[PDB]
Amino acid sequence: RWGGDLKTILHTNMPNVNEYMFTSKFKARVMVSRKHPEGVVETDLSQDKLEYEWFEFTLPEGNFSETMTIDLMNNAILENYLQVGRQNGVLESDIGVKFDSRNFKLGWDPVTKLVMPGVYTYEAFHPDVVLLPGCGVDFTESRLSNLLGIRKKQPFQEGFRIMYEDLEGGNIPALLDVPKYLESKKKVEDETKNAKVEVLPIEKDESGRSYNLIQGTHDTLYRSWYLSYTYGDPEKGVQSWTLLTTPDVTCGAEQVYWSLPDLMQDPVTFRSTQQVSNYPVVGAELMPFRAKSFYNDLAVYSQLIRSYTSLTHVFNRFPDNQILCRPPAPTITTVSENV
């Protein structure tokens, strides 16, 4: 009885995002059409029927540098937005789904329940999602969740669907407008002493896009998954069934199985099937694909430079809106390498 001491040399080169390995082709659910209320005031009040249709989105292959990928996906909802919505009347402030990385509750103050500074701190913390009511995302087939830094707590039960009602516990706080607060502070203090300041959330940005803040409250109809995870109920939030993890461009490292079919005798419980798929495996290894951690402080500063060099704003179509702006680059990330 003869035995062989198998040795194998493997070398591969996989693009970070591709149709295979399901690293591309994620699926979401966005607004498709916003009907007008017939016989009602148009600009005075815009509440009316809304529709939501599931769509599957695709990314161009080979776009590495996950800072790009999170951006490219955003670019795609905007593509769809464009076509379908524009034609059917959805607002541009109602994109619904957007991928970001900011910590929208960073400058939050418990007493005023408002973000005091007036801008959301542009420092990247971790990729997440921002969802309008009635919209959601899916990652059941596509493996972009691993890149997104979101992993399901109980993996086996099927379906990684994220819905607006699921992210219960975290809503993006509104922003205090700097001039109004400063005007009241200077006026009231100087006038009262020589001879109660009020705080107002920002209704909308400069371009006219509406932040759609909740009337009577300092929140908005935007539920950030990151906020729900940390600042939320551990049982009534995503903390119960969703786990935070470090994003990796490699999108995991599956195992490869080496089978030589007609040389090595089949292992214990394998039978000789000439199916293309099934062959008697002989060894198992991780793919030569692996992720190398890379770090540089000037990630945000470098991002601004790329905006000028690229000489186009396809990736920053909404500079005015703060919550719809371009997400910040992450200070520490990974770059895939083949060994």
């Binding site: 005023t112 109660k196 300041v197």
Partner: peptide, 17 residues
Amino acid sequence: RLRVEDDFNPVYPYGYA
């Protein structure tokens, strides 16, 4: 709206760095 007291102190250098 919300009315804070006379000497409410948000701790962000606000006017200028």
